[PDB]
Design a protein around this motif. Structure first.
Motif, PDB file in Angstrom:
ATOM      1  N   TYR A  32      -5.850  20.047  14.405  1.00 27.15           N
ATOM      2  CA  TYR A  32      -5.425  18.670  14.141  1.00 27.15           C
ATOM      3  C   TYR A  32      -4.617  18.523  12.850  1.00 27.15           C
ATOM      4  CZ  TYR A  32      -5.715  13.845  12.474  1.00 27.15           C
ATOM      5  OH  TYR A  32      -5.420  12.607  11.949  1.00 27.15           O
ATOM      6  N   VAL A  64      -9.881  22.472  22.898  1.00 28.32           N
ATOM      7  CA  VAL A  64     -10.098  21.141  22.345  1.00 28.32           C
ATOM      8  C   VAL A  64      -9.549  21.004  20.908  1.00 28.32           C
ATOM      9  CG1 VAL A  64     -12.443  21.103  21.294  1.00 28.32           C
ATOM     10  CG2 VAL A  64     -11.698  19.242  22.798  1.00 28.32           C
ATOM     11  N   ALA A  65      -8.561  21.837  20.584  1.00 30.35           N
ATOM     12  CA  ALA A  65      -7.847  21.744  19.312  1.00 30.35           C
ATOM     13  C   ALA A  65      -6.997  20.474  19.277  1.00 30.35           C
ATOM     14  CB  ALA A  65      -6.979  22.973  19.098  1.00 30.35           C
ATOM     15  N   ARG A  67      -6.376  16.420  18.995  1.00 31.96           N
ATOM     16  CA  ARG A  67      -7.060  15.224  19.489  1.00 31.96           C
ATOM     17  C   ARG A  67      -6.894  15.010  20.997  1.00 31.96           C
ATOM     18  NH1 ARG A  67      -9.542  15.915  15.409  1.00 31.96           N
ATOM     19  NH2 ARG A  67      -9.768  14.431  13.675  1.00 31.96           N
ATOM     20  N   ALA A 107      -7.132  23.657  11.070  1.00 35.79           N
ATOM     21  CA  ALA A 107      -8.225  23.767  12.032  1.00 35.79           C
ATOM     22  C   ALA A 107      -9.548  23.948  11.299  1.00 35.79           C
ATOM     23  CB  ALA A 107      -7.978  24.919  12.992  1.00 35.79           C
ATOM     24  N   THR A 110     -12.906  23.972  15.527  1.00 36.82           N
ATOM     25  CA  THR A 110     -12.495  24.993  16.492  1.00 36.82           C
ATOM     26  C   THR A 110     -12.670  26.429  15.988  1.00 36.82           C
ATOM     27  OG1 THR A 110     -10.175  24.787  15.782  1.00 36.82           O
ATOM     28  CG2 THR A 110     -10.881  23.474  17.692  1.00 36.82           C
TER      29      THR A 110
END
Ligand SMILES: NC(=O)C1=CN([C@@H]2O[C@H](COP(=O)(O)OP(=O)(O)OC[C@H]3O[C@@H](n4cnc5c(N)ncnc54)[C@H](OP(=O)(O)O)[C@@H]3O)[C@@H](O)[C@H]2O)C=CC1
Length: 182
Positions: A32, A64-65, A67, A107, A110
């Protein structure tokens, strides 16, 4: 009367440059933070140059890195990162123990080792990019602050982890500029 201490290490740009040029295999795990800073471009150009020097440079994308699912894939492709070097977690995760340098750019969750190390963690069991298994890790974020899961990351205090603190775009611009000076 209770206290607990945590020791992390911080490196400068020149040290990061040394670790990068010293490395032959590099994995980048964007999150993100890279999305927020819009840092896909300087890292794409950096990867391009490092690839031209014979280095093995690839990206490791957590499902799921960021948003949105696949958000990092979109942003990296927008920056012109070749699709062949953009790999998903399940394909690239086994390569971590055999990699010289991992650049963790914006990150956290994650790449949080507490998922495997802390049985009482709120993220215990959750699959993560096993970055800590590589020879050297450089974590590029603004500080030692938490991510979305609001949880401490044990990788910040691991011997093989160095913190490179600052905005993801600003740091990637500087690393891009210094590597260009060759
Ligand atoms: N992808 C999806 O579909 C969704 C994901 N999520 C959750 O979001 C998380 C995504 O994982 P990931 O992004 O890897 O981890 P995080 O979102 O938790 O971490 C992002 C990190 O980037 C850093 N950062 C923020 N802005 C900047 C900046 N401008 N420059 C440099 N660093 C910055 C922050 O640290 P610092 O403040 O120190 O800079 C932060 O710790 C997961 O926990 C997931 O569960 C939730 C819903 C959906």
């Amino acid at each position: 009367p209770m206290e607990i201490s945590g020791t992390h290490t911080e490196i400068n740009l020149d040290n990061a440059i040394d670790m990068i040029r010293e490395a032959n295999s590099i994995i980048i795990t964007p999150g993100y933070g890279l999305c927020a800073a819009k840092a896909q471009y300087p890292i794409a150009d950096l990867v391009k140059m490092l690839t031209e020097q014979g280095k093995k440079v690839r990206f490791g994308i957590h499902p799921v890195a960021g948003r949105m699912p696949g958000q990092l894939n979109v942003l990296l492709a927008e920056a012109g990162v070749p699709y062949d070097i953009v790999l998903e977690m399940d394909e690239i995760n086994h390569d971590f123990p055999d990699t010289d340098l991992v650049l963790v750019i914006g990150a956290n969750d994650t790449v949080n080792s507490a998922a495997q190390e802390d049985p009482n963690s709120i993220i215990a069991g959750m699959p993560v990019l096993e970055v800590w298994k590589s020879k050297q890790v450089i974590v590029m974020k603004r500080s030692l602050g938490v991510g979305y899961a609001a949880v401490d990351n044990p990788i910040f205090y691991k011997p093989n982890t160095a913190m490179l603190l600052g905005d993801a775009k600003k740091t990637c611009d500087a690393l891009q500029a210094k590597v260009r000076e060759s």
